[PDB]
Amino acid sequence: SIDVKYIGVKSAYVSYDVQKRTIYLNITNTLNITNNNYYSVEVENITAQVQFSKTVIGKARLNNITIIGPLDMKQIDYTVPTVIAEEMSYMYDFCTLISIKVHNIVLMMQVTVTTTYFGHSEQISQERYQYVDCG
Amino acid sequence: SIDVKYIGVKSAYVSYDVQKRTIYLNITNTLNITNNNYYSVEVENITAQVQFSKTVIGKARLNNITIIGPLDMKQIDYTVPTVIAEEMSYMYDFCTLISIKVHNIVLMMQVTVTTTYFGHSEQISQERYQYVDCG
Amino acid sequence: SIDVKYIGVKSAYVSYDVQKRTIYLNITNTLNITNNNYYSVEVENITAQVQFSKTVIGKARLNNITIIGPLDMKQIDYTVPTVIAEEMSYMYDFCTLISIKVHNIVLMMQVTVTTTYFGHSEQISQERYQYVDCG
């Protein structure tokens, strides 16, 4: 929640890149760095009171105070029908990266049906580093 | 929750890269670094009171105070029918990375049906580093 | 929850990379580093009171205070029917990485149906480092 960085190739604080037919003679680098980070995050001071019926007296009557009624969820529900009378295929793959009719699903329910959660919740996802190299 | 970095190739603090036909003569590097990190996160001071009926007196009556009624979930429910009368295939793969009709599913329920959770929850996922190399 | 890093190739603090036809003569590196990390996380000071009926007196009556009613879950329920009258296949794989009709499922329920959880929960997942090399 401070630096969520998606970096393509490289990351550094001090970086020297010398490439591809160069000449680099008798140089004099001198760094006098002072890099201090003082993080102080999420310092919370909470004080909560969550009653549904506080101090009910005197011949009263309550009924259906908190109703979360009929609930229905259908998160991922899809249909891929296929009717073919005749089919032919010819794949001639080389040094490649194929994916045919796969189903890549990721689901993350952190705090589902509940009551009176305190504190801190956190979900992170970063997946499928795929790669192909040839020479 | 501070640095969630997706870095493609490399990461460093001080990095020297010298490549591909260079000459690098009698240089003088000198680093005087001071890198201090003082993290202080999530310091919480909580004080909660969660009653459903606090101090009910005097010939009263309660009923159906907290109802989380009929609940239905269907997270991943999909259909892939297939009707074929005649089928042929020819794959000639080489130095490749194939995936045919696979089903890659990941599901993570951290705090499902519950009541009065305190503290801290955390879900992390990073998967499927795949790779193919040839020469 | 501070550095959740997905790094593709390499990680370092000080990194020297000298490759691919270079000349590197009589250099003088000198590092005077001071790298201190003072982590102080999740320092919590909790004080909770979770009653469902605190101090009920005086000829009262309660009923159905906390109902989590009829519950149904169906996490992963999918159908892959297949009807074929005639089928032929020819795979000629070489130096490759195939996957046909597999089912890779991962499920992690941390805190399912419960009541009054305190403390800390944590789920981590990172799987399937696959790889193929040829020469």
Q: Find the residue in B nearest to A50 (Cα).
A: B50
Lookup: tokens for B38: 């003082």
Q: Contact B121/A115, CB-based, under 8 Å?
A: no
Question: What is the spatial distance between Cα A25 and Cα B17, in angstroms, rounded to a whole number?
Answer: 16
Determine the distance from the C-alpha atom of residue A107 to the mean position of all C-alpha atoms in its chain, rounded to a whole number: 11
- As a whole number of Å, the end-to-end CA separation of chain C is 41
Q: Which candidate from B29, B100, B119 shows the least CB-CB separation from C30? A: B29
Beta strands at B71-72 and B6-7: parallel, antiparallel or unpaired: unpaired
Q: Distance from A19 to chain C by nearest Cα, in Å? A: 9
Which residues pair with residue A10 across a beta bridge? B10
Lookup: tokens for B18: 């010298």
Q: Give the number of other Cβ atoms within 10 Å of residue C96's Cβ.
A: 22
Q: With contact defined as beta carbons under 8 Å apart, do B47 and A47 qualify? A: yes
Could you tell me the resolution of this structure in angstroms?
3.4
Q: Among residues A134, B129, B97, which one has the least CA distance to residue C130? A: B129
Lookup: tokens for C87: 């089928």
Lookup: tokens for B23: 């000459």
The experimental method behind these coordinates is cryo-EM
Q: What residues in A contact B102, CB-CB < 8 Å? A: 102-103
Question: What is the spatial distance between Cα C123 and Cα C116, in angstroms, rounded to a whole number?
Answer: 19
Q: Distance from A40 to chain C by nearest Cα, in Å? A: 10
Q: With contact defined as beta carbons under 8 Å apart, do A95 and A134 qualify? A: yes
Q: Contact C8/A129, CB-based, under 8 Å?
A: yes
Q: Is B23 exposed, middle or buried (0-12, 13-18, 19+ CB in 10 A)?
A: middle
Determine the distance from the C-alpha atom of residue C111 to the mean position of all C-alpha atoms in its chain, rounded to a whole number: 15
Q: With contact defined as beta carbons under 8 Å apart, do B42 and C39 qualify? A: no
Task: Give DSSP secondary structure letters for B84-127.
Answer: ES-B---EE--S-B--BS-EEEEEEEEE-S-S---S---EEE--
Q: Find the residue in B nearest to C44 (Cα).
A: B44
Q: Give the number of other Cβ atoms within 10 Å of residue C62's Cβ.
A: 17
Q: Contact C46/B42, CB-based, under 8 Å?
A: no
Task: Give DSSP secondary structure letters for C1-53.
Answer: --B--EESSEE-SEEEEE-SS-EEES-B--EE--EEEE--B--EE--EE--SS
Lookup: tokens for C11: 């990680």
Which residues pair with residue B103 across a beta bridge? A103, C103
- At which residue do the structure tokens 């994916």 appear? A99
